[PDB]
Amino acid sequence: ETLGEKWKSRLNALGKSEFQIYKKSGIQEVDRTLAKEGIKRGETDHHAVSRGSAKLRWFVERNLVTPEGKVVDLGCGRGGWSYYCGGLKNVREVKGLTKGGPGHEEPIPMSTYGWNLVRLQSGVDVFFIPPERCDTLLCDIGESSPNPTVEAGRTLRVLNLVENWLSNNTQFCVKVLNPYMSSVIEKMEALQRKHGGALVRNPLSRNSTHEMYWVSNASGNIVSSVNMISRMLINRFTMRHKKATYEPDVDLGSGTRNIGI
Numbered sequence: 178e179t180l181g182e183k184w185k186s187r188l189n190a191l192g193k194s195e196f197q198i199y200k201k202s203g204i205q206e207v208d209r210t211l212a213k214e215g216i217k218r219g220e221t222d223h224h225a226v227s228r229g230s231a232k233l234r235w236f237v238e239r240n241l242v243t244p245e246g247k248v249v250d251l252g253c254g255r256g257g258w259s260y261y262c263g264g265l266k267n268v269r270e271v272k273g274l275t276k277g278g279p280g281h282e283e284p285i286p287m288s289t290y291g292w293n294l295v296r297l298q299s300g301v302d303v304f305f306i307p308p309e310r311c312d313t314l315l316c317d318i319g320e321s322s323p324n325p326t327v328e329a330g331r332t333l334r335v336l337n338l339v340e341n342w343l344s345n346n347t348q349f350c351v352k353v354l355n356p357y358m359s360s361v362i363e364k365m366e367a368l369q370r371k372h373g374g375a376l377v378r379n380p381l382s383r384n385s386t387h388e389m390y391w392v393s394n395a396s397g398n399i400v401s402s403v404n405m406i407s408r409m410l411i412n413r414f415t416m417r418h419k420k421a422t423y424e425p426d427v428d429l430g431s432g433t434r435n436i437g438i
């Protein structure tokens with residue numbers, strides 16, 4: 178049943194080195210060697226806390242998601258999406274939330290452009306806190322699993338979360354870990370019916386995830402766009418040139434922002 182599931186099993190059948198080779202075959206990457214060595218030293222200016230900033234940049238530079246006003250970042254991790262939104266013109270406030278703790282990503286304090294508008298807190302489980310007013314809602318939650326039914330449940334769980342934070346006309350960028358399972362496809366169709374947007378594949382995503390993002394300023398038939406990605410991921414199982422094309426990492430500048438009137 179379904180292309181994505183067929184893709185999933187071939188993926189699970191892949192050897193430990195076949196998997197790694199496949200994971201990056203023909204994908205788009207961000208050159209992060211030097212930014213990570215800077216962060217390690219302790220630099221807090223210019224650098225991105227993770228490859229997630231570049232990730233979000235791809236969507237924003239194409240108006241698929243136009244962050245503005247108060248931005249809530251569910252599952253901010255180190256703060257990749259949050260610090261990036263902190264430098265955008267129309268952004269007034271950014272609030273990031275994560276689980277944190279031993280063996281989980283924790284926010285890293287930075288001084289990138291507009292950091293003073295960024296509040297990052299860990300020790301928080303977004304699934305059980307009351308929804309807050311939000312102009313733009315970001316969510317990058319979704320732990321992958323060898324079992325597609327497990328991911329299907331994790332995905333429905335975040336889709337039900339973001340729904341209660343979604344008011345009408347809120348800008349959003351929500352990760353949909355497993356968009357191919359039949360039960361997630363159904364929910365996404367409902368969600369889109371009530372809230373526009375569409376699922377879009379980020380070229381920076383690795384081939385090892387069927388990861389798609391529900392973005393507000395986009396359109397397209399759900400089933401149609403998901404199968405399009407399933408075929409793409411299956412095609413990449415057998416590639417002659419599998420070199421990943423790199424791009425310089427994002428520069429988040431430095432300094433406080435003075436929004437004023």
Ligand SMILES: Nc1ncnc2c1ncn2[C@@H]1O[C@H](CSCC[C@H](N)C(=O)O)[C@@H](O)[C@H]1O
Binds near residue numbers: 276281317319
């Ligand atoms: N219920 C929950 N509440 C809060 N954070 C959660 C959560 N479930 C998962 N997470 C967190 O969400 C994070 C998603 S990884 C995303 C990182 C971010 N987009 C980057 O660019 O900076 C994980 O680090 C994980 O610890």
